[PDB]
Structures are given as C-alpha cells and as structure tokens.
From a paper:
Here we analyzed how membranes control the efficiency of human BRAG2, an ArfGEF involved in receptor endocytosis, Wnt signaling, and tumor invasion. Arf GTPases are pivotal regulators of most aspects of intracellular membrane traffic. They are activated by guanine nucleotide exchange factors (ArfGEFs) that share a conserved Sec7 domain, which stimulates GDP/GTP exchange. Members of this family carry a calmodulin-binding IQ motif in their N-terminus, a Sec7 nucleotide exchange domain followed by a PH domain and a predicted coiled-coil in their C-terminus. The crystal structure of an Arf1–BRAG2 complex that mimics a membrane-bound intermediate revealed an atypical PH domain that is constitutively anchored to the catalytic Sec7 domain and interacts with Arf.
We confirmed that BRAG2 has the hallmarks of an Arf1–GEF by showing that a mutant in which the catalytic glutamate was replaced by a lysine (BRAG2Sec7-PH/E498K) traps Arf1–GDP in an early intermediate of the exchange reaction and that removal of GDP yields the subsequent nucleotide-free Arf/ArfGEF intermediate. This allowed us to solve the crystal structure of the Arf1–GDP/BRAG2Sec7-PH/E498K complex in two crystal forms (crystallographic statistics in Table S1). First, instead of forming an isolated domain, the PH domain is expanded by the linker that bridges the Sec7 and PH domains (residues 592–627), which forms a small subdomain rather than an unstructured tether. Next, this expanded PH domain establishes a large intramolecular contact with the N-terminus of the Sec7 domain remote from the Arf-binding site. The interface buries a surface area of 1,800 Å2, suggesting that it is a constitutive rather than a regulatory intramolecular interaction. Finally, the PH domain of BRAG2 displays a striking sequence difference with phosphoinositide-specific PH domains: Glu639 in strand β1 replaces a highly conserved lysine in the canonical lipid-binding pocket (as reviewed in). The crystal structure of the Arf1–GDP/BRAG2Sec7-PH complex captured the relative arrangement between Arf1, the catalytic Sec7 domain, and the PH domain in the course of the exchange reaction. First, it shows that Arf1 forms edge contacts with the PH domain. The interface involves the switch 1 of Arf1 and the Sec7-PH linker subdomain and is loosely packed (250–450 Å2 buried surface area). Next, the structure shows that BRAG2-bound Arf1–GDP has undergone a two-residue shift of the interswitch, a conformational change that has been shown to occur prior to GDP dissociation and to secure active Arf proteins to membranes (, reviewed in), suggesting that the complex mimics a membrane-bound intermediate of the exchange reaction.
Numbering used by the authors:
A (entry chain B): 393 to 610, 620 to 758
B (entry chain G): 18 to 179
The structure:
C-alpha cells in the first residue's frame, strides 16, 4: 500500500486519519480501517489505540466509553484484556488503566470505562472478590477511589472538607450489601491516592498545553484542541517591507507551527529557567501558500500569502530566516502542514456532499 | 455555594456546565473524574458538581449532600419517553433528608427542538406543583444557545446570597 518504505502522501493520509479521530473518534477509526492503516477487528483497533502515538487520550476515552456502539464495547473489552491486574490492589490496577486513557468527563462515559475495568479486575483477582458479600463492591469502590482523587486534587474543592482518612472510610459504610469493606484496605487506598495523584500519560496535546501557558495575550484563543499537534518552534525575523532594508536582529518573532495553525510571538521575559511569549498574530493554514524570496536586503526570505476564492492573493506576512537551513526546514514543515489541512477540508466537503442524499 | 447538578444522561448537564464556565480562565487540565467547575455569577461563587453515577454508586455523594445548598435538575424537554424516569430520579433525590433545605432549579432544556415540552408541561410531568416546603423554579432553556441559563442563575443567586 505505501510507496518507498514510507511515502509523503501515505504519511499525510495516516496523519489525516489521526486528525479525524481527534475530532470524531468513530469517524477517525472508520477512515483508518478504510485506508488500511488499522485492521477491522476489535483486537486490532484496541492494540492500535493502546500503542500508536498521535491520538488524544481524552478522545481514546470518548471512543472506548461509547456504551451504545457494539464495536466500541468489544474494543474496550479487548483493551482491558491486554491489562495485567493480577496481584495488584484496586488503586494500583486503576492507576495502570487510567494511564492509557483519560477517564475524565461525563458520568456515563466514566461509568462505562471503570465498569469494564471492574469486570477485568475481578477476573484477575478472584480471591479478592470472594471477601465481598457483593461483586458490585469492586465497581463501587473503584468509583470511590476516582471520587477521592477528584476531591483531594481538584482546586474547586479547596481544603474545606477535602476528605480525611476517616471521612473516606465513613463515606463507604454499608457499601458491601449492608456491611463494611475492611478498614485497613480503605486506609491503604486512601494513603496511596494521597501520596500520588491519578494522572494519565503525556499526550501529543500535553506539549500544546505546555506551549499555550507560556503565551501571554488575546493564551492565543485556547490552542490545545484534541486534534491540534505542535509541528515546530522556530525564530524568524519579521519583514514589514521586503522592498526596504532593516537592522539584523529587528522584529525577532518566535513561530509555533501546529498541524492547522501558525502562531507568531515577540518574546516577553526569557528570564533564567523559563521563557514566556507575547502573541502577535495567528494564521489559519487553509488557503495559504509559502514562497521563498531573496533580494539585495534579505537572503533567506519567506512570504506567506492567502489565496481565497475571488479576492485572490493577499500578503499575510513576510519573514527573514537566520540561515538558509532554517528557511528550508520551516518552509518544508509549513508546506506539508498546508497540504495536510487542504486534504482535510477537501475530505469534509466530500463527506458532507454524501450526507446530503 | 455547593451546587449539585443532576438529571438523566443526555439531558444536557455537561453542555450546561461548560457553557456556564466558558467565561472563566481554564489555565490547567482538570483532575481525573467527573465534572466540577466553580462559576462566579453576580459576585457569588458556585461550585457545580455535574453527577450521574447510576444508582449503584448513588450511596456516595452523601458526604457532599449534607453541605449541598442548591440542586440543578436538568430535563431533556424533547424526551417524552424518559420524562417519567426523570420524575423518578428527581423524587428519589428530593426524598434525601440531607437535601431537605436545598433550593431546586429545574432546567427544562432543549427548548430549541420543535417537539420540546413547554416549562408548564414539564412542571406537570415532574409533579413540581405537589412539592410544599421547597424553594423551586423552572426555567426553559436551550443550553447550546445559552438561552435561559443566566435567568436560572439569577433565581439561584437570589435564593443563596452568602
Ligand atoms: N439541540 C440541543 N441539544 C442540546 C441541548 N443541550 C444539550 N444538548 C445535547 O444533549 C446531548 C447530551 O448533553 P450533555 O451536556 O452531554 O449531557 P449529560 O446530561 O449527558 O451530561 C449532546 O448531544 P450530541 O452528543 O448528539 O451532540 C448535546 O449536544 C440543547 O439545549 N439543545
């Protein structure tokens, strides 16, 4: 299916599938299967979500928690079956499970994951389930652990009555078909959560959030959308007039290229340990073109222009790169990003032209 | 002010929470679990808990229940098939002694849909008229457009002014 090992177009199509997933998981999966990037079995899709980087972990949870789709339910069961919960206490097992997917949001979504998790934990630990007068006690306790994690670590709670190990114990009184879960078990669970929060593994979006917080102005209109990935950061000097010359270090911008957007910033502090960005402007990639230019004043020049249907050609911005190498690098990355964005819109217009029938 | 937001799945609770919070700074990734956000209105801060934990995990929340000052009950006004189930869930909550003093705001949501039942019709279907020792208000809303939300908050802020 691909060209020489790995092909520009095929890699673009694979990235398009991932972009679609992060916006709509059911649509992204269908696309990947149809384009032969993912096999059609629930086990294959389960492996794919678990391994393959580039997927938003919040969106993995959205897909896996679908409760109504028979395919998703089977994907979840395969996902959970790949996990090794034997000989782990409930919090340890949940830490492992919740690291691969973001178990956060809508109560029905969290319930579906977690019910699938609880079934698996009980299968892997049948000697634990025998201690209980009711099997649903593992499911209930799993949510008590989740609720505790929220209570202890959500800033919206504030040390009002952030649960003590005693409040946690008493809250769970009578849960086991009228009887209590062992005090020492609950204490252990409590102390484990207190010592370390349930976190979810670093996503492709983790990096976008890291960037977004360093930016100070208009954060740059909530750039940390599930689909959004940061392609590269590069310093470039802004050229207001390519026809006139300027001082070397003049108009030092800091560019951030995301798969669908170009953000430009002047710096703020630099400081010692950390740098902060000002935010100058944001450019959507759709309909934009990149062109290199060299004149008597600028050697490694770049001009971004947007060609809209009818108003045709607008010079968005002009830049001078410090070296030909940086110019080439940035231009190649930006060009690829544009094409990726072009086919994405080309697709959604076709997908909509079919919906209308 | 502690607010518990309940109602059936698909009623629009999460949509409401994020629509209400939208105007306040999200500088950090929210902690693992269910939805909780603090909303400031007319200089009053409401911590709104967006819950739905089946009936299996219903005994929990009871820790909070003691200190809950207000209840927001969200109903999908277009879902006639589940209106009786919504009534059941509301009455099951209202029966709790821990919530005896809580004020009740009902959001008759999804008013944008052509077949949506009116606030007066929902009032009848939920049996709100039969409640006595309770401060309650029903507000027709469209969570997607934001219509009716701040009117609901006006009543709720006036009830709680703390
Ligand atoms: N038209 C309309 N839809 C609304 C309104 N409020 C919520 N919804 C829809 O209701 C669905 C579930 O609502 P949500 O806020 O997720 O709910 P919850 O109670 O399940 O937590 C969503 O549908 P989808 O998942 O299909 O997007 C959302 O778009 C409203 O006022 N009007």
């Amino acid at each position: 299916s691909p060209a020489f090992s790995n092909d520009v177009i095929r890699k673009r199509h694979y990235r398009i599938g991932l972009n679609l997933f992060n916006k709509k998981p059911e649509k992204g999966v269908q696309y990947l299967i149809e384009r032969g990037f993912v096999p059609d079995t629930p086990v294959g899709v389960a492996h794919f979500l678990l391994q393959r980087k580039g997927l938003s972990r919040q969106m993995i949870g959205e897909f896996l928690g679908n409760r109504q789709k028979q395919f998703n339910r089977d994907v979840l069961d395969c996902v959970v079956d790949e996990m090794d919960f034997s000989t782990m206490e409930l919090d340890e097992a949940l830490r492992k499970f919740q690291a691969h997917i973001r178990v956060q949001g809508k109560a029905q979504k969290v319930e579906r994951l977690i019910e699938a998790f609880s079934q698996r934990y009980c299968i892997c630990n049948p000697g634990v389930v025998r201690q209980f007068r009711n099997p649903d006690t593992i499911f209930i306790l799993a949510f008590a652990i989740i609720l505790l994690n929220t209570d202890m670590y959500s800033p919206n709670v504030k040390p009002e009555r952030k649960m003590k190990l005693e409040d946690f114990i008493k809250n769970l009184r009578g849960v086991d078909d009228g009887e209590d879960i062992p005090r020492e078990m609950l204490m252990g669970i409590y102390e484990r959560i207190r010592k370390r929060e349930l976190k979810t593994n670093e996503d492709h979006v983790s990096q976008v959030q890291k960037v977004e917080k360093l930016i100070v102005g208009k954060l740059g209109c909530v750039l940390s959308l599930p689909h959004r990935r940061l392609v590269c950061y590069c310093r470039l000097f802004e050229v207001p007039d390519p026809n006139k010359p300027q001082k070397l270090g003049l108009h030092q911008r800091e560019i951030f290229l995301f798969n669908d957007l170009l953000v430009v910033t002047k710096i703020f502090q630099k400081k010692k340990n950390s740098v902060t960005y000002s935010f100058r402007q944001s450019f959507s990639l759709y309909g934009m073109q990149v062109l290199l230019f060299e004149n008597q004043y600028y050697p490694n020049g770049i001009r971004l222009t947007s060609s809209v249907p009818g108003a045709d050609i607008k010079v968005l911005i002009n830049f001078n790169a410090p070296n030909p190498q940086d110019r080439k690098k940035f231009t190649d990355d930006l060009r690829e990003s544009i094409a990726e964005v072009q086919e994405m819109e080309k697709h959604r217009i076709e997908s909509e032209l079919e919906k209308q029938k | 002010m502690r607010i518990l937001m309940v109602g059936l799945d698909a009623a629009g609770k999460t949509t409401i929470l994020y629509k209400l919070k939208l105007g306040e700074i999200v500088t950090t990734i929210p902690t693992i679990g269910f939805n909780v956000e603090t909303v400031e209105y007319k200089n009053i801060s409401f911590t709104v808990w967006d819950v739905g934990g089946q009936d299996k995990i219903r005994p929990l929340w009871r820790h909070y229940f003691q200190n809950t000052q207000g209840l927001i009950f969200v109903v999908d006004s277009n879902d006639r098939e589940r209106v009786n189930e919504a009534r059941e869930e509301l009455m099951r909550m209202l029966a709790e002694d821990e919530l005896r003093d809580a004020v009740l705001l009902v959001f008759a949501n999804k008013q944008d849909l052509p077949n949506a039942m009116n606030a007066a019709e929902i009032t009848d279907k939920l049996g709100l008229h039969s409640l006595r020792h309770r401060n309650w208000y029903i507000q027709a809303t469209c969570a997607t457009s934001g219509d009716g939300l701040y009117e609901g908050l006006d009543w709720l802020s006036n009830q709680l002014r703390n």
